[PDB]
From Swiss-Prot, chain A:
Function: DNA repair protein that may operate in a postreplication repair or a cell cycle checkpoint function. May be implicated in interstrand DNA cross-link repair and in the maintenance of normal chromosome stability. Candidate tumor suppressor gene.
Subcellular localization, as worded in the UniProt entry: Nucleus; Cytoplasm
Tissues and organs where the protein is expressed, per its UniProt entry: Highly expressed in testis and thymus. Found in lymphoblasts.
Oligomeric and partner information: Belongs to the multisubunit FA complex composed of FANCA, FANCB, FANCC, FANCE, FANCF, FANCG, FANCL/PHF9 and FANCM. The complex is not found in FA patients. In complex with FANCF, FANCA and FANCL, but not with FANCC, nor FANCE, interacts with HES1; this interaction may be essential for the stability and nuclear localization of FA core complex proteins. The complex with FANCC and FANCG may also include EIF2AK2 and HSP70.
Protein name: Fanconi anemia group G protein
Superkingdom of origin: Eukaryota
Disease in which the protein is involved: Fanconi anemia complementation group G: A disorder affecting all bone marrow elements and resulting in anemia, leukopenia and thrombopenia. It is associated with cardiac, renal and limb malformations, dermal pigmentary changes, and a predisposition to the development of malignancies. At the cellular level it is associated with hypersensitivity to DNA-damaging agents, chromosomal instability (increased chromosome breakage) and defective DNA repair.
Residue ranges of TPR repeats: 104-137
Organism: Homo sapiens (Human)
Swiss-Prot record, chain B:
Species for this entry: Homo sapiens (Human)
Subcellular localization, as worded in the UniProt entry: Nucleus
Superkingdom, natural source: Eukaryota
Taxonomic lineage from the root: Eukaryota, Metazoa, Chordata, Craniata, Vertebrata
Subunit: Belongs to the multisubunit FA complex composed of FANCA, FANCB, FANCC, FANCE, FANCF, FANCG, FANCL/PHF9 and FANCM. The complex is not found in FA patients.
Associated disease: Fanconi anemia complementation group B: A disorder affecting all bone marrow elements and resulting in anemia, leukopenia and thrombopenia. It is associated with cardiac, renal and limb malformations, dermal pigmentary changes, and a predisposition to the development of malignancies. At the cellular level it is associated with hypersensitivity to DNA-damaging agents, chromosomal instability (increased chromosome breakage) and defective DNA repair. Some severe FANCB cases manifest features of VACTERL syndrome with hydrocephalus.
Role summary: DNA repair protein required for FANCD2 ubiquitination.
Encoding gene, per UniProt annotation: FANCB
Protein name: Fanconi anemia group B protein
Length: 160, 89
């Protein structure tokens, strides 16, 4: 199911994904059209006792699902212009498995959220954090250039 | 037994202030312990509600401190290991 849902999340079939996981849990959870509630509600059934080996296991997949889905929900809501729904899902990225390149991108994403809300000093927090933890400091310096443009700090913008 | 708390300052190299105090006296017997009353006997005394009994287990036990660094992840799995795998109150 984990693997099926990984295919449908790479190929943008989020309605059928929901339907599958609704069927998996009690279908009483039918109105819960949020995925990021169903994916948490979805319980892998065993500790995976002495069976054949595996390169991965139900939880080790579910924990990648929650973070990838929440990250994607966040970026869609940002570009679509709801940087009020974004912050919930972009903190749900960091509260669970988050390889550090996933966290750098979550932080640039929150810099964007706050700049669009009109809180440039909070955006600066998350972009400094992304600079520190990242070996990839393109997307933060770009967010900074856009921030100094928004304020007027043109010398700082051109330096960024 | 009687109980003697001794205190020595470290900053003053005169050894000036070697105060003490007698903090009291413990009576103990077999007629006490035969009626429980001071023991910790596990699982019956699960619900920990006299904090002396917590402080006794944080005394008696072999303590060991570990640093955990996850250097290419974030580390949140702990609370789950604690609450779900280890089934912590």
């Amino acid at each position: 199911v984990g693997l099926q849902a990984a295919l449908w999340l790479s190929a943008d079939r989020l309605g059928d994904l929901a339907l599958l996981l609704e069927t998996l849990n009690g279908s009483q959870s039918g109105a819960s059209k949020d995925l990021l509630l169903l994916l948490k509600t979805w319980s892998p059934p065993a500790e995976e006792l002495d069976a054949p080996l595996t390169l991965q296991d139900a939880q080790g997949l579910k924990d990648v699902l929650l973070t990838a889905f929440a990250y994607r929900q966040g970026l869609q809501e940002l570009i679509t212009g709801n940087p009020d729904k974004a912050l919930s899902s972009l903190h749900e990225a960091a509260s669970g498995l988050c390889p550090r390149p996933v966290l750098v991108q979550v932080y640039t994403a929150l810099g964007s959220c706050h700049r669009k809300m009109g809180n440039p000093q909070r955006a600066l927090l998350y972009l400094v954090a992304a600079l520190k933890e990242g070996s990839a400091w393109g997307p933060p310096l770009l967010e900074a250039s856009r921030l100094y443009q928004q304020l007027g700090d043109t010398t700082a913008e051109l330096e960024s | 037994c009687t109980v003697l708390l001794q205190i020595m300052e470290r900053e003053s190299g005169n050894c000036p202030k070697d105060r003490y105090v007698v903090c009291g006296r413990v009576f103990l017997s077999l007629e006490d312990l035969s009626t429980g009353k001071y023991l910790l006997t596990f699982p019956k005394k699960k619900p920990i509600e006299h904090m002396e009994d917590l402080f006794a287990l944080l005394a008696a036990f072999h303590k060991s401190c570990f640093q955990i660094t996850s250097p290419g992840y974030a580390l949140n799995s702990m609370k789950v290991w604690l609450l779900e795998h280890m089934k912590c109150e």
